[PDB]
């Protein structure tokens, strides 16, 4: 089997991407944030504290003939940005782009943090990291991909995120029309539960490539590109007037600037992030200070190849017995 679904930016900045997901019988379609950095499929629901729901579409398990309470199971998750959610668990039928999993754990939120409430466009998350990170207790549950894997034509999914445009998540096949040149594959460590890999270096603009190992995670659920302070300083030094602002919470730059591109290495291959992908617009409405899309990972504890990086590539998440990651230009 295979599946193919369009993923759409939630706003004009590509702050996140939403993908429609069918849950239950008859189907209830919710728009979920596909997150290769976590491993829980959780949704706003009829059980979510009413004051914490503000425009989201909810899953109502009592209206699904295939929903079953997973008795005694609870979940609770916190993300890198300090947001969080928790609740109980149902199993139900879940379909993405024509690919159906029966008995998928659907984690129903009883509580969500303010950042989730305030984002009316995101009805929940669909985790695509390794199932070892799943938070359900006392019986850990599998991701949608893990459940689907044996049925797929090939044990893979691909992320093709757009810049200010829709893109595609495919399951079970590689669309050879969706990228240019060849796909370069690179080793993955699953030791921390992430799609963790080592970039071979970087360049700023038309500058020379610096060969240096940068361990990080491919994370569709993180907006920006978080890299070591040395690398990030080298990038922003090429933008007149750019500076790190403790008050704002990262590098800012004059909105009048033209940003240089940023290249990262994948083995001997190179992925080029155009300068415009690194612009996240005014820090507040009407400001002439703009927020940068490349930020320091210092104090995160891990480097994160988030959407800024991934949307410059066609990305293969290969879930074979020994997982790997592939990157192509597009």
From Swiss-Prot:
It catalyses: Hydrolysis of proteins with specificity similar to that of pepsin A, prefers hydrophobic residues at P1 and P1', but does not cleave 14-Ala-|-Leu-15 in the B chain of insulin or Z-Glu-Tyr. Clots milk. The active site is at 35, 199. Keywords: Aspartyl protease, Disulfide bond, Hydrolase, Protease, Signal, Zymogen. Disulfide bonds join 255-290. One of its GO terms (molecular function) is aspartic-type endopeptidase activity. GO terms for biological process: proteolysis. Its EC number is 3.4.23.22. Residues 17-328 form the Peptidase A1 domain. It comes from the Eukaryota. Belongs to the peptidase A1 family. This is Endothiapepsin. It comes from Cryphonectria parasitica. The lineage of its organism: Eukaryota, Fungi, Dikarya, Ascomycota, Pezizomycotina.
């Amino acid at each position: 089997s295979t599946g193919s679904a369009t993923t759409t930016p939630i706003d004009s900045l590509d702050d996140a991407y939403i993908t429609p997901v069918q849950i239950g019988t008859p189907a209830q379609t919710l728009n979920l944030d596909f997150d290769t950095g976590s491993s829980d499929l959780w949704v706003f629901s009829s059980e979510t504290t009413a004051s914490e729901v503000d425009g989201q579409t909810i899953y109502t398990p009592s209206k699904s003939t295939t929903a079953k309470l997973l008795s005694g199971a609870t979940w609770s998750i916190s993300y890198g940005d300090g947001s969080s959610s928790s609740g109980d668990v149902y199993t139900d039928t879940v379909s993405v782009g024509g690919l159906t999993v029966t008995g998928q754990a659907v984690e129903s939120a009883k509580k969500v943090s303010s950042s989730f409430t305030e984002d009316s466009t995101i009805d929940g998350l669909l985790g695509l990291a390794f199932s070892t990170l799943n938070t359900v207790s006392p019986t850990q549950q599998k991701t949608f991909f893990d459940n689907a894997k044996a049925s797929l034509d090939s044990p893979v999914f691909t992320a093709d995120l757009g810049y200010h445009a829709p893109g595609t998540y495919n399951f079970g096949f590689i669309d050879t029309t969706a990228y240019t040149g060849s796909i370069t594959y690179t080793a993955v460590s699953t030791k921390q539960g992430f799609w963790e890999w080592t970039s071979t270096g970087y360049a700023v603009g038309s500058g020379t490539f610096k060969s240096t190992s940068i361990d990080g995670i491919a994370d569709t659920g993180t907006t920006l590109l978080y890299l070591p302070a040395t690398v990030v300083s080298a990038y922003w030094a090429q933008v007149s007037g750019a500076k790190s602002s403790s008050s704002v919470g990262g590098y800012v730059f004059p909105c009048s600037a033209t940003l240089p591109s940023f290249t990262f290495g994948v083995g001997s291959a190179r992925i080029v992030i155009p300068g415009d992908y690194i612009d996240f617009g005014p820090i507040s409405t009407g400001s002439s200070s703009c927020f940068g899309g490349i930020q320091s990972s210092a104090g995160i504890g891990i480097n994160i190849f988030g959407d800024v990086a991934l949307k410059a590539a066609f990305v293969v998440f290969n879930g074979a017995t020994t997982p790997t990651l592939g990157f192509a230009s597009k």
